[PDB]
């Protein structure tokens, strides 16, 4: 059971916990800088042991409103933001994604 | 066991069975009009991936703040619970139980 946390970019934290072929995740932090729509989060990459074979789309929600987003974890670990351009908000979201 | 099928309206559902848990990935793009609360009639989820109880799979549309959900009943005839839509790129990775 390996655990990892890192600020992907823009203040967004991603926490991961590997349990066999399944990775448990938790989106954290708050948006502290501007994140462009469909942009790479270049501050931190997901380590190799948590990188999936297939591009995984993690659906999150912004605190206080009806707003949803998704962050993709590709096989490279360079996460991509698929919400619109944003510079504020509290992103949250717990779930799992598969590995091999 | 793995499976992929275009449910309807261009929406793809990719499934992978792992014991009593099904792993899902929403793909494709909306290529035709999908009515609010309508049946996805192009492809049914196969029996081996059909749950005992109705499952609500949450997704997100690329580029904005828009979310939706697709229910998988025991029949596998999925129903769209977003509003009426004719465009957008639906995504979302998650799980649902078989039980």
């Amino acid at each position, epitope marked *: 059971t390996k655990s990892w946390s890192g600020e992907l970019g823009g203040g967004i934290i991603l926490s991961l916990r590997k349990k066999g072929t399944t990775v448990e995740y938790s989106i954290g932090g708050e948006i502290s800088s501007s994140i462009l729509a*469909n942009s790479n989060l270049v501050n931190r990459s997901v380590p190799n042991e948590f990188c999936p*074979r*297939n*591009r995984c789309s993690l659906v999150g929600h912004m605190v206080g409103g009806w707003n949803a987003f998704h962050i*993709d974890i590709p*096989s490279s670990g360079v996460c*991509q933001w698929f919400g619109p351009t944003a510079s504020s908000g509290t992103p949250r979201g717990t779930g799992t994604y598969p590995i091999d | 066991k793995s499976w*992929s099928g*275009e449910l309807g309206g*261009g929406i*793809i559902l*990719s499934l992978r069975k792992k014991g009593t848990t099904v792993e899902y990935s929403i*793909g*494709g*793009e*909306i*290529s*035709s009009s999908i009515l609010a609360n309508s049946n996805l009639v192009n492809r049914s989820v196969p029996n081996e991936f059909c749950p005992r109880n109705r499952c609500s799979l949450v997704g997100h549309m*690329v580029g904005g703040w828009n979310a939706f959900h697709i229910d998988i009943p025991s029949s596998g005839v999925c129903q769209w619970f977003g509003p009426t839509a004719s*465009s957008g*790129t639906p995504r979302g990775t998650g799980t649902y139980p078989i039980d």
Partner: nanobody
Amino acid sequence: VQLVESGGGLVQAGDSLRLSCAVSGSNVIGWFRQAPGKEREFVAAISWSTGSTYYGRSMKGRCAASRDKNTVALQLNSLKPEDTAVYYCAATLDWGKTLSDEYDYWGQGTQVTVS
């Protein structure tokens, strides 16, 4: 994965054109089109392993992808000057991706001009 687009040229409205993706070095081969000063569109996807196909919004009912010759073909029918764009071939391990951002390997492209 190395990708080279063959076929493509000038043709008229209602005509047909067959494109070809010479693949070397992925499971799904995607097809994209971009008209100058326009949004890049997904056209079609084909699985090399299985023969499964998927067609985007752009050319539904007027296009068909096939498998061959490490070749992937894209048949285009009922062509209209709107389908005028550069046609790209792309590769990924994943089904069923429709975004340019979701594809890892790309081809040079091939120009298709209608009317």
